[PDB]
Amino acid sequence: SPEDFVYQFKGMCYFTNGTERVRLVSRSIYNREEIVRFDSDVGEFRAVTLLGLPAAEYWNSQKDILERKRAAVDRVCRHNYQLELRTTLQRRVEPTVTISPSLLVCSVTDFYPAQIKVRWFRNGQEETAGVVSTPLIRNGDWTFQILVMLEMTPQRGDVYTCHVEHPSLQSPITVEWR
Amino acid sequence: NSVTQMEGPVTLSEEAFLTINCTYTATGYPSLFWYVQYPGEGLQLLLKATKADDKGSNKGFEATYRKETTSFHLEKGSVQVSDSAVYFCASPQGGSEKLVFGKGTKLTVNPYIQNPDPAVYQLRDSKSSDKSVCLFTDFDSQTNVSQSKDSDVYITDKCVLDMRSMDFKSNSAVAWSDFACANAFNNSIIP
Amino acid sequence: IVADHVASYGVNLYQSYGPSGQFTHEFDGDEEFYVDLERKETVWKLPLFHRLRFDPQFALTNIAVLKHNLNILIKRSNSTAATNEVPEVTVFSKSPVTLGQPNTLICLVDNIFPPVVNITWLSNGHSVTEGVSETSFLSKSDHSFFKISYLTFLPSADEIYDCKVEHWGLDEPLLKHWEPEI
Amino acid sequence: GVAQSPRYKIIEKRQSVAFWCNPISGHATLYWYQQILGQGPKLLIQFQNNGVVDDSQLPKDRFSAERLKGVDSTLKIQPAKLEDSAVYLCASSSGGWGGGTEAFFGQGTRLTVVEDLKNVFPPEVAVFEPSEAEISHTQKATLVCLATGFYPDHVELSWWVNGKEVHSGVCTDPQPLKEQPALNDSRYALSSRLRVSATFWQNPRNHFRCQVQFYGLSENDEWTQDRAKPVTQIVSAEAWGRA
Amino acid sequence: APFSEQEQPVLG
Ligand SMILES: *[C@@H]1O[C@H](CO)[C@@H](O)[C@H](O)[C@H]1NC(C)=O
Ligand SMILES: *[C@@H]1O[C@H](CO)[C@@H](O)[C@H](O)[C@H]1NC(C)=O
Ligand SMILES: *[C@@H]1O[C@H](CO)[C@@H](O)[C@H](O)[C@H]1NC(C)=O
């Protein structure tokens, strides 16, 4: 293994309720160690690691840098959110949902955004015993997929139903399995 | 572009209140600047406001970044004759924040001439003694001079000199070039 | 930190190995665009139409400040190198598999550090270059990275696929298997 | 601050010029502006580090700039158009890397593009002594300096009492006068005032000197005409105290 | 255009 020295910088913006509560955190990282952090709720630089102490003590002395960072939550975060409000936040793609055993699985694939709740029905009554669900799988191509399995005792059962709700669905999707 | 300044020259007295309007248009959250250019010098940064409700202050000049009116008006309570310069409103625009300047506003601050003593003296060369120059001094700041009607007669525009050691300021103009001093400065107010 | 939406308007990366670097914008965990630092070119990844524009020069000069700070910090740490983590690989399809219906195989390599790795696909034990693509290094809260590789494949009863990742934390080229259960 | 070179430059109508600029150490952004006579700085080009970021207002027909290694820059104009007579400012800014976006300006390069290098002549300067009238009337003495017959407007006038530069009581004209206004390459004339008390002018030890610094032709500029080559020079005029 | 955050240089 050859030696490698990494360095990272992350200007991360946090949005809550549109642009009501917006918070900027610019993280300077040596390898995996965040050394200096500019927290917009703090107002100035704060060293997190011994390495970041001379960097934070210097940046805090420069008045021009402080004014830029204190205004970056507007100049960067809130500005980009305005064009984010016209592009990615408008993106709504409907999930494709299928049912197949391997245990009964409900394959909900290719949907955006991430907020999604799916429920299992047995004969009309919501079967909640042994419904193991999977994490939210990020495909990395601006789509998500989630699998939901159910411990099914099928003998003399009639019609299992998968029921999913999503922000792209005016009326929720229902697909059954007789 | 994206920054509109107070179009036109401004002239004020030695203790007047200076106000230069400047408005911005650009979307987003831009920074706003004021640059000064004293006569015969380069552009200096006077003051700046980086974000909302920040007020830049320098040399007695003040400017409040006001989002409610998209303004950034420059103000000074007691202007001075040394404040005579050109003032530029500037705001960086575009994705790269290029500093683009407005038209600018020329400001000349005339002194308050307490007790005028207008006179038209004749000053003669220190090397020869047959070429001379007419000099108009100690006139009021309201007094104004104009270029002579004759094409081959030169008159300067007035200028303000201040002898700080004695707290004294006075205006001055020069005429040189058949005419004489008594009728050289005429075709003006000549109090 | 809790928020409705979290964006990384500047995941800046520079390492001494190549030397190489990376500049991307992330919103809610997905990659908006990256900047090819060698070609000085912005490459967008938005799944929409947009007339947006980003000057690639910002990336080049931002990464330059990173290089400046990195060299000074390698010195102030008595030369502390990056410790190699063990990547966690997972292979899965994008859509449910139907015979003859073109699909996409996804290879998620998680917990990558340092940000250096080869990801290739094998079909029936042999290498494949047609129809493979990947994402940039996406950022993680613990300041590691994860990468996702894609293989467009045609489901059949005779094609077998493996994902071959290589990292210094492995000491052995990992192969994750996947078979088309119709 | 930012260093620019040259300070003044004279070039013929159909000819080339190159302006050099060294920004403040470590500043990413670098601008070239154009300021024509009494106007504002018109932006020509903006550099990021070594890469051009904005050049929408750069007339590529003759204007061109470069910042190869991302530190100093050079702006070139070829050929020249008589409309190019202006002050070419260079400015640098941290651009957000190390400081703010505010730009720090250099001295600029005053370019005067002439019709022919044969209308370039230095100034003659004379100083005129105070009048006996005002010394008994106002108890003050006014000296007058007059630089005439120079072209172009590349002059820097200063007063010097006893070898020390004086600014108190001094007053030069903001703009010169054309000898013959209709002429477009007309020689200029400039006046200035220095005021002192009656007792100061009446001291034979007080030496009044008016320097006007002229900036003219370069070394390599060809000059044949019998009139002395108008190289950049200093022309002075002096006076002494008397009673 | 999308703005982006700028990393600051440390003293050498
Ligand atoms: C969201 O903002 C609205 C204002 O439109 C406010 O009334 C509401 O309380 C906010 N929601 C929160 C604080 O959770
Ligand atoms: C590591 O650091 C100390 C000083 O901080 C020095 O004494 C030591 O020799 C260094 N050696 C190595 C191998 O890093
Ligand atoms: C990737 O492959 C190249 C050549 O194929 C090799 O030199 C390099 O070491 C590989 N990367 C890793 C992390 O093993």
Nearest to B188, CA basis, from B138, B136, B110, B111: B136
- With the CA atoms of D81, D85, D86 and D90 taken in that order, what torsion angle do they form, in degrees rounded to the nearest 10? 50
Q: Which residue has the least CA distance to atom 14 on ligand 3?
A: C166
Same domain, A98 and A176: yes
Same domain, C150 and C73: no
Beta-strand runs (E) in chain B: 3-5, 10-12, 18-20, 22-24, 32-37, 44-49, 55-58, 61-64, 74-76, 85-93, 98-101, 105-109, 119-124, 132-137, 154-155, 159-163, 168-176
Q: Between the CA of residue A124 and those of A119, A155, A162, what are the distances in Å?
A: 11, 16, 11
How far is residue B11's CA from residue B108's CA, in Å, rounded to a whole number?
5
Name the pairing type of β-strands B10-12 and B105-109.
parallel
Q: Locate the chain B residue with the closest alpha carbon to E4.
A: B95
Contact B7, B23 (CB under 8 A): no
Contact D69, C64 (CB under 8 A): no
E8 touching A, CB under 8 A? yes
Contact B11, B94 (CB under 8 A): no
Q: Which residue has the least CA distance to atom 10 on ligand 1?
A: A17
Q: Are B28 and A71 inside 8 Å of each other by CB?
A: no
B61-80 exposure pattern, b = at least 16 Cβ within 10 A, e = fewer = bebbbbeeeeebbbebeebb
Name the pairing type of β-strands B168-176 and B159-163.
antiparallel
How far is residue A35's CA from residue C73's CA, in Å, rounded to a whole number?
10
Helix/strand/coil percent split, chain C, to 5: 10, 45, 45
Domain spans in chain D, listed from the N-terminal domain onward? 1-115, 116-243
Same domain, C146 and C179: yes
Q: Are B50 and A78 inside 8 Å of each other by CB?
A: no
Q: Are A70 and B50 inside 8 Å of each other by CB?
A: yes
Choose the closest CB to D168 out of B33, B132, B164: B164
Complete DSSP assignment for B150-177: STT-EEPPPEEEEEGGGTEEEEEEEEE-
Ligand 3 pocket test: which of C86, C119, C166, C172 has the largest number of ligand atoms within 8 Å of its C-beta? C166
* Cβ count within 10 A of residue D225: 9
Residues facing residue D34 across a β-bridge: D42, D88
Q: Locate the chain C residue with the closest alpha carbon to A99.
A: C96
**Residue C182 DSSP code:** -
Cα(A89) to centroid of ligand 1, in Å? Answer: 19
Same domain, C141 and C94: yes
> Closest ligand to C79 CA?
2
Q: Between the CA of residue B154 and those of B143, B148, B175, D107, D154, what are the distances in Å?
A: 18, 7, 6, 31, 20
Same domain, C40 and C129: no
Same domain, C55 and C102: no
How far is residue D47's CA from residue D72's CA, in Å, rounded to a whole number?
11
Contact C25, C58 (CB under 8 A): no
Same domain, A31 and A5: yes
Q: Tokens 């172009």 identify what position? A: D152
Which residue type sits at A140?
A: G
How far is residue B41's CA from residue A125's CA, in Å, rounded to a whole number?
85
Same domain, C29 and C65: yes
Coil, helix or strand for B99?
Answer: strand
Complete DSSP assignment for A12-45: EEEEETTTTEEEEEEEEESSS-EEEEEETTT-SE
At C117, which CATH number?
2.60.40.10
Contact B45, B61 (CB under 8 A): no
Q: What is the CA angle D66-D70-D75, rounded to 5?
A: 25
- Here the tokens at position D178 are 């054309």
Of the residues C36, C54, C81, which one is the last residue of a structural domain? Answer: C81
- Here the tokens at position A77 are 């975060």
**Residue A93 DSSP code:** B
**Distance to chain A for B173, nearest Cα, Å:** 45
Domain enclosing residue C12, as ranges: 3-81
How far is residue A69's CA from residue D142's CA, in Å, rounded to a whole number?
55
Of the residues A90, A119, A140, which one is the last residue of a structural domain? Answer: A90
Nearest to D80, CA basis, from D5, D15, D33: D15
Please give, one letter per residue, the 3-state secondary structure of chain D: CCEEECCEEEEECCCCEEEEEECCCCCCEEEEEEECCCCCCEEEEEECCCCEEECCCCCCCCEEEECCCCCCEEEEECCCCHHHCEEEEEEEECCCCCCCCCCEECCCEEEEEECCHHHCECCEEEEECCCHHHHHHCCEEEEEEEEEEEECCCEEEEEEECCEECCCCEEECCCCEECCCCCCCCCEEEEEEEEEEHHHHCCCCCEEEEEEEECCECCCCCCCCCCCCCECEEEEEEEECCC
Of the residues A53, A74, A90, which one is the last residue of a structural domain? Answer: A90
How far is residue C138's CA from residue C31's CA, in Å, rounded to a whole number?
7
How far is residue D35's CA from residue D38's CA, in Å, rounded to a whole number?
8
Contact A158, A124 (CB under 8 A): no
Same domain, C41 and C106: no
Alpha helices in B37-171 (DSSP H): none
Contacts of C60 in chain D (CB under 8 A): 48-49, 51
Helix (H) / strand (E) containing A54: helix A52-59
- Number of structural domains in chain A: 2
How far is residue D33's CA from residue D39's CA, in Å, rounded to a whole number?
12
Q: Are B29 and A75 inside 8 Å of each other by CB?
A: yes
Of the residues A66, A90, A114, which one is the last residue of a structural domain? Answer: A90
User: What length is written for chain D?
Assistant: 243
* Cβ count within 10 A of residue D128: 26
Write down the CATH number for the domain with range D1-115. Answer: 2.60.40.10
Of the residues C29, C50, C81, which one is the last residue of a structural domain? Answer: C81
User: What length is written for chain B?
Assistant: 191
Same domain, C90 and C165: yes
Cα(C79) to centroid of ligand 2, in Å? Answer: 9
Q: Tokens 């081959």 identify what position? A: B152
Same domain, A84 and A98: no
Same domain, A35 and A75: yes
Contacts (Cβ under 8 Å, ≥6 apart) of A176: A99, A159, A160, A161, A162
Contact C176, C90 (CB under 8 A): yes
Which residue type sits at D234?
A: I
How far is residue A53's CA from residue A15's CA, in Å, rounded to a whole number?
29
Q: Which residue has the least CA distance to atom 12 on ligand 2?
A: C78
Q: Residue C149: phi, psi to the nearest 5?
A: -110, 145
Of the residues C58, C81, C104, which one is the last residue of a structural domain? Answer: C81
Nearest to D75, CA basis, from D16, D19, D2, D14: D19
Nearest to A160, CA basis, from A176, A172, A174: A176
Maximal CA-CA distance, chain C: 58
Same domain, C68 and C89: no
Contacts of B54 in chain A (CB under 8 A): 67
Domain enclosing residue A58, as ranges: 1-90
Same domain, A97 and A169: yes
Helix (H) / strand (E) containing A103: none
Same domain, A4 and A38: yes
User: Which ligand 3 atom is the nearest neighbour of the CA of C167?
Assistant: 13
How far is residue D109's CA from residue A27's CA, in Å, rounded to a whole number?
43
Q: Which residue has the least CA distance to atom 1 on ligand 1?
A: A17
Same domain, A106 and A30: no
**Residue B9 DSSP code:** -
Ligand 1 pocket test: which of A20, A21, A22 has the largest number of ligand atoms within 8 Å of its C-beta? A20
Same domain, C89 and C175: yes
| D156 is annotated as contributing to ligand binding | yes
Same domain, C27 and C100: no
- Here the tokens at position A29 are 């990282």
Q: Are E8 and D97 inside 8 Å of each other by CB?
A: yes
Helix (H) / strand (E) containing C136: none
Quick one: residue C77, left, alpha or beta (phi over 0 = left, psi -120 to 50 = alpha)?
A: alpha
Choose the closest CB to A70 out of B27, B28, B51: B51
Coil, helix or strand for A72?
Answer: helix
Q: What is the CA angle B157-B161-B164, rounded to 5?
A: 170
**Distance to chain D for A60, nearest Cα, Å:** 11
Q: Tokens 């009326």 identify what position? A: A171
Coil, helix or strand for B130?
Answer: coil
Resolution in A: 2.8
Same domain, C101 and C57: no
